[PDB]
Design brief:
Length: 221
């Protein structure tokens, strides 16, 4: 039931709305690779998506909500997020991985390894620790599930120990995203999966800011 070692290749494009408030327009493309269910039937078409996040980075509180749709046949994602509290204390790229991996495209020969769709409609809990090199850290926990026919992502974020002179709080990261491989492994002791990858954030000066991701996913029903 639990999947074998594999990874997700994901491409991301960040943009703005010509009408626009603080906002981010997200286009994502994700595909599984690396291998030699009543839940999958729910993703045979376009699916509405809702995202809700409440954060607290070094005492600064903020809130983001987003709307969009996903097409799991292509592994395509389209979302628009909005700050319901003004200019955010952190850069938009730092929240990209936090702001719905059941829309990854799994090839037909590895459909028996998609854990995200198999947990639907009841959903799963996604917990993460993002550690920025020589800086602070993010600690997130989220519930991803179906509410009627809409996929809902509700996340709780808490950042600590961020330097006031750093790339995150100082808003020194460019408004773009690189491509990453998300390596997935099974965790039988908790009947879920674990994920691991390092995100590369481009700094305006030309250097790179590393963010190490430690992710764990557990089913609900």
């Amino acid at each position: 039931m639990l999947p074998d070692n594999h990874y997700l290749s994901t491409q991301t494009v960040l943009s703005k709305d010509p009408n626009e408030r603080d906002h981010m327009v997200l286009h994502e493309y994700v595909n599984a690779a690396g291998i030699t269910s009543q839940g999958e039937e729910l993703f045979t078409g376009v699916v509405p998506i809702l995202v809700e996040l409440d954060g607290d980075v070094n005492g600064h509180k903020f809130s983001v909500r987003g709307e969009g749709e996903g097409d799991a046949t292509i592994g395509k994602l389209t979302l628009k997020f909005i700050s319901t509290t003004g200019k955010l204390p952190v850069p938009w790229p730092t929240l990209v991985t936090t702001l719905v991996q059941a829309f990854s495209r799994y090839p037909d020969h590895m459909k028996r390894h998609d854990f995200f769709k198999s947990a639907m409609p009841e959903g799963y809990v996604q917990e993460r620790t993002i550690s920025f090199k020589d800086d602070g850290k993010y600690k997130t926990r989220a519930v991803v599930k179906f509410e009627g026919d809409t996929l809902v992502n509700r996340i709780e974020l808490k950042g600590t120990d961020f330097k006031e002179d750093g790339n995150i709080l100082g808003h020194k990261l460019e408004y773009n995203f690189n491509s990453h491989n998300v390596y997935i492994t099974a965790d039988k002791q908790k009947n879920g999966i674990k994920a691991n990858f390092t995100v590369r954030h481009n700094v305006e000066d030309g250097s790179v800011q590393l963010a190490d991701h430690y992710q764990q996913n557990t089913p609900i029903g």
